[PDB]
Write a protein that binds this ligand. Structure first.
Ligand SMILES: C#CCN(Cc1ccc(F)cc1)c1cc(C)c(NC(=O)OC)c(C)c1
Ligand SMILES: C#CCN(Cc1ccc(F)cc1)c1cc(C)c(NC(=O)OC)c(C)c1
Ligand SMILES: C#CCN(Cc1ccc(F)cc1)c1cc(C)c(NC(=O)OC)c(C)c1
Ligand SMILES: C#CCN(Cc1ccc(F)cc1)c1cc(C)c(NC(=O)OC)c(C)c1
Lengths: 339, 144, 339, 144, 339, 339, 144, 144
C-alpha cells in the first residue's frame, strides 16, 4: 500500500529527472533559464556600471540556484533507490560514483563556497568566485547524455570528410592567393596592408563575410581583385555551413531509422521466447495452466511484433517486399516443377 | 472435444478458484505469482485486454474456450516468426549462427536460462560451421 | 432567377475574399501593397525632414485605406450570407463573432479614430495616432488562416530539435570560449575589450558575420585567435539557417503528401455510400428509378475515386504495389494448394 | 431480356415524361427534386456527362440500355471498393472497427442516416472485439 | 558537290551559333569575355583618374567588338538559309523579324553610332555614348533562350511559396519588432537611433548580416536586445537563400526528368508509324520492296525506342515495374481460372 | 625469413605513406601541422615586431622540417621497392620520374637552399628565401591524389551549371541595377558615391553581405533603395554557396555508389574465371588435384561475389528486383503455356 | 520456302540492280529516292548498320534472308509496342482517345497523311466516348 | 561411390603426402607452389577457412569428402553466375559482345591467357554481330 505509492512517485521523479520526456523537459527548461539567469548576471557583473545591481541580483539568484540545485540533488539521490540495482546505501554510493553525479556535487560545493566567500568578502575570495561562476556551465555539459551533440557533429564531419576537405582546401587556397595579390597591389598605397599578415587578416575577415571594415582595399586595382576573389571565397567559406547542415539532417534521419529498427529487437526476442515456451508446453492441471500462460504470452508478443513491423522507410518496405518476392520465386519454381 | 472442454473448464476453475466464471487482473496475477515469477500489473492489464473481447474488464469462459481452441500453428504465425528470426539474421541469408542466437535468447527480452539456451542449440543439428537455418526451426514450430 | 444570380455573385465574392485561390490573391496582393503604403509612409512620418510631405501623403492614403477597408468589411459581411449557417441576421452576428472579423472592425474604428484625431489635431491625439498606426499590421496577422506560418515554423523546429540543439549548444560554447580568450589576450592592449561583456558583444557580432567593426581585435595573437575561432563559429551560427531551410522544404512536402491523401477521404466515403445505396436497391417504377439513380451515382463516385488514386509518391505507389503483392501471394499459395 | 427492356423503357418514360426519348439536365433534375433531395446543377452536368457518350448534351435511350445492362459486379469495382475501404483501414490490416466506420459513413461525403449506419454495422457479424474484415463486405457487394 | 559542302558548313555554323552545344559554347564564352571587356572598361571610364587610358582602351575594344558583332550578324543571317523555312530572301527577312535578331541589329547600330560620336566628340554625343554603352548587356539578355533563368526562378519561387512566405513573414515581424525595441531603448542615449526610420535601417543592415557599422547599439540593454533578436533575424533572413537553392536543385532535376521522358515521345511515334507501315504492307516487286523498307524501318525504330526506355529514375522504373505487375496479376488470375 | 619481414615492413611503410588509410592519416595529419607550423611562422616573419622571434622559431622549424622531409623521402624511395615493377635501381629511377616525387625533391632542395642562405645571410638570399617559403604549400598540392578536390568541384559545377548560371545572371543583374540606382540617388549628396565604379564597389560589398561600411547610403531614398535591392541581392549571392553544397553532397554520394559498384567488378571476374576453370576441369591424380583446386577457388569466389552483392541503394535493390521480376514473368508465361 | 526465297532474291536484284550481291548505302539510297521520299545519308548509314551484321559496310544476301525470314510478330515487339502506346496513354488506363492519337500520329515523328490518320481511327471501333483500348490494336498488330 | 571415394582418398594422400590425414596451410601451399603458380599466404588462410568447418585450422578428410560430393551445379550457383555476367552486361539486355568479354576475362581478376580467351569466344557461336547471350553460357555451366 504505502510502498506501492512510494515507489510510484520515486519512479515518476526518476524518469522526470534522469530520463526526461515530454513535459519533464519543461522542468529542465525552467532550470536552464535559471542557468542563464546566472551566467548573464555574472557577465553583467563584469560591467563596472552595473556591478552593484548585477552583484545584488546575482547574490539573490545564487541563493535561489543553490536551493534549487540542492533540492534537485537530494531528489535525484532519493529517486535512484527506485531501481533494485541502486536500492539501499550501496545504491546511493554507486550513483554518487557516476561522473555526472560527482560533477553535480562539485558544482554544488563550488556554489556554496561562492556564497560563503561573498559573505566574507575577501579579495582573494573575489577571484575564487569569478572562477567558480564559470563552474555553472557544467550543468549544461551534464545535460546531454554523454556527448550526443559532440558525437553527432563528429559523425557528420567524418561522413562528409570528402566535401569538407575539398571546401577547406579550395577556400584556403583562395584565401592565401587573394590575400597575397591584394597585399601586392596595396602594400604601398594603403598603410593598413603594410605586411602580409595584415593582408591575411583582411582576407579572413572578408571571405568569411564578417567585413569589419578596419582594413579595406583602396586602389582601384585592389578593389577589383578583392571583389573578384571575394566572390569565390565567400561561397567556399559558406560551403562548410551548408555541408554540415545537410549532414546533420541526414545523420539524424539515419539515427532515427536505426532506432526504429532496434525497436524491433526486443519484441522479436520476446516473440521467439514465448514461441518456444508454447512449443515446450506440448501436475497435469499445472502443466495445462503453463501451456495457457505460454500461448497467451505468445499471442501478446506476436501482437507487439506485428505492431512494430510497420514499414518506416521505402527501403525497409521494399526489403520486406524482396523477402516476399524470393518466397514467391521459390513457390513459382516449385509450381513449374509440379506441372 | 468433450474431454478437451472438461480439461479447459478444470483449468479455468484452477485459475479463478471460484464460481464467478471470470478471471480479473488480480485473480490472474495471484495465480501467476504463486508460481514465483514476479509479474507487473501493466502486463496483466495488457494480457486481459488481449484475451477479453467484450471489453468488460474480465474474461468470460466462452472467450476462454474461443481463444483456446485456436491452435498456435497458423500462416500468420509462420510469417511473423520467420520475420522475427530474420531481424537477427545478418545479411538476410536465412542462416543464424549458434553464438549470437544464444546471446539474443539469453539476454534480449525475457532472459532465458542458460540450460534452456543449450537445449535450443542442441534441438537442431548445429553442424555446418555453426550456421543453422532458422527455416527448419520455423517449420518445426509450425508442426506443433 | 434574381436569387440565383444574387447567390452566385455572393459566393464568388465570398470565395475571392475568405478562400482566395489564383487570381483572387491578386486583390489581396493589391491591398497588401496599400498595407505597406501605410506602414512605410508612417515610418517616413517619423523622419522630421519629410514629416510634412509624409504626413500629407499618409492622410490621403489613410482616407483611401479606410474607404477600401470599409468596402471590404461590408462586402465580407454581405457575402457571409451565402452559406445557410450564416444566412440572415443571426448569420451576420455569428460572423461578427469570429476573432478575425472583430479584429477587422477594431482596426477599422482605430483608423476612423485616427482620421478624426488628425482632423482635430490634439497633441494627445498625436500619441493616439502613432499608437493606432501599428494597428494596421494586424491585417497581415489576419491574412494567414490561423497561424499557418507559425505552425510550420514550430513543427519544423520540433522535427529538427536534435540538430538545432546540437548547433545551438556547440555554437554557444564556441561563442563563450572565443569571447573569453580574445578578452584575455586583449583586455589591456585594446580599450574596447575592457570588460567581458564587451568581448561577448564582439563575439556575437563576429560569429554571426555581422561584423560591425566597432570592436575588432588589435593584438596579433588576438587576431589569430579571433580568426581561428570565427572560422568555426560562423559555420555553427549559419547552421540553424540551413537546418531550418531543409526542414521547411521537407515539412511542406509532407504536408502536401498528407493533403493529397486526405483528398481521397471524401471520394472514398462517397464511393462506399453509393455502393451500399445500389446494393440496398436490390411503386416498383419508383424503386427502379431509385436503383438507376443509385447505380449511376456509384459509377460517378467510382470515377472520382479512381481519378484520385494516382500515385503521388514512390512510397504510396509501392504501398499499393505491396497490397497487390500480398494479393498475388495469396493467389499463388491457393494455386499451389490446388496443384 | 424483353421484360427487362420493357421495364427500362417504362423507367425512361417516367424519367423524361415525354416522347422526346432524351433526358436533359433539367429533365433529370426536376424528377430528382420531386423526391425531395435538393440537387446541384453541377453534379447534374457531371452525371449527364458520365452517362451520355455521344457528347450531344442529352441521354439517348440506346446508351440508357447500354449502361443499364452492365451489372455492378466487376473486378474493377472489386478492387476499387477494396481500396476505398483500405483508405480508412488503419495499419492496412484488412480489419475496420465498428466505431470509426460508423463515423465515416454518417459524416464523410454524403452523410448517411443513423438508422442506416446501424443497419450497416448489424449487416455483418460485429463480433471479434468490434473489428470486422471489410473483405467479407466487398465479397457481399460483389455477389449482388 | 559544292552545294553539299556549302550547306554542311552552313548547318555547322548555325548550330554553333543558334543552338550551341559543347565546344560551341567556347566561342560564346569568348565573346562573353569581350562583353565584360566592354562593360568593365566603360565602368573604368567613369573613374576620372583612368578616364584617359580607359577611354583609349574602350575605343580600341569598341572597334574590335563592332567588327566581331558584325561578323557574327552576317554569319548568322547567312546560316539562317540552311533551313528551308528560312531559305532565300524571304527567309532572311523572316529571321530579321525575330526579336533577338532585331535586338542584335539595334545594338549594332548603337555601337556604330557610339563610334561615330566618339570620332566627332560632341558633348551631347558623350551623353549619347554613355547611354549606348549599357546597350551592350542586352547581348547577355539575348543569350538565354527566352528567359530560361527567369522561368526557373519564377517556377521555384511559386513551388516554394509556402516556405518563402513563412520566412518572409516571420523575418519581417522580427525586423519590425527588434528595430522598434532597439529604437525604444536607444532613442535618447544613441544619436544615430534618433528616429524609427534610422532604427529600421539599422535592423535591415543587421539582420541581413551586412553590418555596415554606421549604426550600432550603444546601451548595454540595447546591445543585449539587438544580439538576442539578431540571432533569430539572421537565420530568418538567410532562410530564403537556402530555400531557393534547394528549390533550384529540385526544379532542375524535375526539368531533366521531364526532358528525358519527352525524349521518348518522338521515338515512340516513329515506332507506331513504322509498325502500321509494316502492317499495311501485308507491281508485286515494288510492293515487296515497300514491305522490306517498312519492316526494316520498324526494326530501327524499335531499336531506338528500347534504347530510350532505360529507367532514368526509381519512380519511372517502379512504374514500368507496376505495369509488369498488373500484367502478372492478370496472368495469375487467368491461371487460377484455368485450374 | 629475413626477406619476408623486410618486405612486410616495406609494404607497411609504403601503404602508410602512399596509400594512407585510417591511422596512417594521423602521420600525415602530424606533418600537416608541421606544414602550418612553417607557413604561419613565415607569415609572422613578415611582421616587423616579431620578425626576430619568428625568424628564430622558423629556422628551428625549418631544420626540423628538412630532417622530417628527408626522412620521408628516403623512406618513400626505399618502400617503392616493395612492388616488383619498382624493385631495383630501375624501380627507384622510375619512381623518381613521378611528378610528385620530383616535386618533393625540388621542394627539399629549396628547403636546403633556404637553410644555406639563412646561414649565409645575403640580402639577395633573403629574397630567395621568401620565394622558397611559399614552395612548401606544394606539399599540400601533392597530398591529394591528382586533384580529387578540383575534380569534385568541377564536376559539381558542371552538373549544376543551370542553377549556377541562373543565380549568377540574376545576381549580376541585381548588382548592376541596384548599384546604378543608388549611384543615381546619391551621386551628389554622398561623396563616396562620386563615380559609378564606387557604387559598383559598394554594391559588391553589400550584396555579398561583407558590409565594410566605408561606403554606405546616406539619403533616405538611397537607404530605401539599397535595402530593397539588397534583400534580393544577398539571397542571390548566397545561392551559389547552397547550390554547391548540395551538389557536393550529391556528387560524393554518386561517387560512393559508383565505387561500391566497381567493387563488384573484380570479384565477378574472379567468379567467372574459376567457374570456367572448374568446367574445363571436367596424370589423372594431378588432373583431379587441379579439379579440386579449381572447384574450391570457385567456392571462394562465389562467397566473395555474393558478399559484395548486398543492395547499397534502393535503386540497386529494385534493379535486382526487376531482374527477378522479369525472370518470374518468363516463368509464369511458361506456366500459362503449359496449362 | 522456295517461292519465298525466289521472291526475296528477285527483290534483292531489284534493290542492287546488279550482280554484286550486295547493297551499299548509295545503292539503297538511290532506289529509295526513286520512290520520291528524300532520304538522309545518316539514316541510310544507320539502316545498313542495323541490317548488316558482318560489319563490312554492305549487306550480304545471307543476312538479307536471315533478317527477312524473321517475322514481325514477337513478344519483344508486343511489349515494345505496348509501351510505345503507353507513353501517350494519359493516366495509364490502357485507353487512348481518337483525338490526341490522331495528332500524335500526324505530327510527331514521321508525319502521317490525314487520310492515313482517318484510316487509323476507322480501323477499330471508335465507339465508347472516343476512348479505344490500344491493347486491341497491339493484338491486331501481333496477328499480322 | 566406392571408386569415387578411393579417388578422393588418393588425391588427399597426394595433397598431404603423409598419414596425418589433415592438410595445413603450409601443406596446401607447398603442393600448390609445386605446380609453379606463386600463391599468397593470405588466400591460403582464406581457403582453409572456406573448406574447414570445425575451425581447428586444418582440413579433416570427412569434410574433404563432404564438400567434394557436393556438385558444382546448383540454383544458387546458377543465379550467382547469372548476376556475375550481368555486372558486365551493359544495358542489362542479356547479351555480351565478344570484345569487352575478352578484355574482362584476360585483364580483370586473375588474368587469363590469350589462348584461353580465344577458347572462350570460340566455345559458343559468336555469330549475331558479336553479341552472344550469356544465358546459354550459364546453362552450359549448369550442365556440367
Ligand atoms: C573554406 C574555407 C576556409 N577554411 C579552411 C582553412 C583552413 C586553414 C586555415 F588556416 C584557413 C582556412 C575553413 C572555413 C571554415 C568555415 C571552417 N569552419 C568550419 O569548418 O565549420 C565547421 C574551417 C575550420 C576552415
Ligand atoms: C549556433 C549558435 C548560437 N546560438 C545559440 C545561442 C544560445 C544562447 C545564447 F545566449 C547564444 C547563442 C544561436 C544561433 C542562432 C542563429 C539562433 N537563431 C535561430 O535559431 O534561428 C532560427 C539562435 C536562437 C541561437
Ligand atoms: C526573412 C526576411 C525579410 N524579408 C521579408 C521582408 C518583406 C518586406 C519588407 F519590407 C522587409 C522584409 C525578405 C528577406 C529576403 C532575403 C528577401 N529576398 C529574397 O527573397 O531573395 C530571393 C526578401 C524579398 C524579403
Ligand atoms: C549571384 C551573384 C553574383 N555573381 C555573378 C557575377 C558575375 C560577374 C560579375 F562581374 C559579378 C557577379 C557571383 C556570385 C558568386 C557568389 C560567385 N562565386 C561562386 O560562384 O562561388 C563558387 C560568382 C563567381 C559570381
Amino acid at each position: 500500500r504505502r510502498n506501492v505509492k512510494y515507489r510510484r512517485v520515486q519512479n515518476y521523479l526518476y524518469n522526470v529527472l534522469e530520463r526526461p520526456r515530454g513535459w519533464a523537459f519543461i522542468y529542465h527548461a525552467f532550470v536552464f533559464l535559471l542557468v542563464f539567469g546566472c551566467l548573464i548576471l555574472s557577465v553583467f557583473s563584469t560591467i563596472p556600471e552595473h556591478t552593484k545591481l548585477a552583484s545584488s541580483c546575482l547574490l539573490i539568484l545564487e541563493f535561489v540556484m543553490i536551493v534549487v540545485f540542492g533540492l534537485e540533488f537530494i531528489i535525484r539521490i532519493w529517486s535512484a533507490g527506485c531501481c533494485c540495482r541502486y536500492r539501499g546505501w550501496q545504491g546511493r554510493l554507486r550513483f554518487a560514483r557516476k561522473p555526472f553525479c560527482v560533477i553535480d556535487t562539485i558544482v554544488l560545493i563550488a556554489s556554496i563556497a561562492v556564497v560563503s566567500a561573498k559573505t566574507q568578502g575577501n579579495i582573494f575570495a573575489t577571484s575564487a568566485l569569478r572562477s567558480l561562476r564559470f563552474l555553472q556551465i557544467l550543468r549544461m555539459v551534464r545535460m546531454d547524455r554523454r556527448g550526443g551533440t559532440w558525437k553527432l557533429l563528429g559523425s557528420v564531419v567524418y561522413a562528409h570528410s570528402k566535401e569538407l576537405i575539398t571546401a577547406w582546401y579550395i577556400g584556403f587556397l583562395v584565401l592565401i592567393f587573394s590575400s597575397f595579390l591584394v597585399y601586392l597591389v596595396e602594400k604601398d598605397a594603403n598603410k593598413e596592408f603594410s605586411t602580409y599578415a595584415d593582408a591575411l587578416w583582411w582576407g579572413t575577415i572578408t571571405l568569411t563575410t564578417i567585413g569589419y571594415g578596419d582594413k579595406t582595399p583602396l586602389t582601384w586595382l585592389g578593389r577589383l581583385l578583392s571583389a573578384g576573389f571575394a566572390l569565390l571565397g565567400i561561397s567556399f567559406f559558406a560551403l562548410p555551413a551548408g555541408i554540415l547542415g545537410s549532414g546533420f539532417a541526414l545523420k539524424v534521419q539515419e539515427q532515427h531509422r536505426q532506432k526504429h529498427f532496434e525497436k524491433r529487437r526486443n519484441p522479436a526476442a520476446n516473440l521467439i521466447q514465448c514461441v518456444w515456451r508454447s512449443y515446450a508446453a506440448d501436475t497435469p492441471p499445472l502443466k495445462t495452466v503453463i501451456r495457457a500462460i505460454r500461448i497467451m504470452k505468445f499471442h501478446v508478443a506476436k501482437r507487439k511484433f506485428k505492431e512494430t513491423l510497420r514499414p518506416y522507410d521505402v527501403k525497409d518496405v521494399i526489403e520486406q517486399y524482396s523477402a516476399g518476392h524470393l518466397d514467391m520465386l521459390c513457390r513459382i519454381k516449385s509450381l513449374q516443377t509440379r506441372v | 472435444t468433450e474431454e478437451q472442454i472438461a480439461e479447459f473448464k478444470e483449468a479455468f476453475s484452477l485459475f479463478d478458484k471460484d464460481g464467478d466464471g471470470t478471471i480479473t487482473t488480480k485473480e490472474l496475477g495471484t495465480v501467476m505469482r504463486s508460481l514465483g515469477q514476479n509479474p507487473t500489473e501493466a502486463e496483466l492489464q495488457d494480457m486481459i485486454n488481449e484475451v477479453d473481447a467484450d471489453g468488460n474488464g474480465t474474461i468470460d469462459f466462452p472467450e476462454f474456450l474461443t481463444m483456446m481452441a485456436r491452435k498456435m500453428k497458423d500462416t500468420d504465425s509462420e510469417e511473423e516468426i520467420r520475420e522475427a528470426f530474420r531481424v537477427f539474421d545478418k545479411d538476410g541469408n536465412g542462416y543464424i549462427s549458434a553464438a549470437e542466437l544464444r546471446h539474443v535468447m539469453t539476454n534480449l527480452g525475457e532472459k532465458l536460462t542458460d540450460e534452456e539456451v543449450d537445449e535450443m542449440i542442441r534441438e537442431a543439428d548445429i553442424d555446418g560451421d555453426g550456421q543453422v537455418n532458422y527455416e527448419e526451426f520455423v517449420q518445426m514450430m509450425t508442426a506443433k
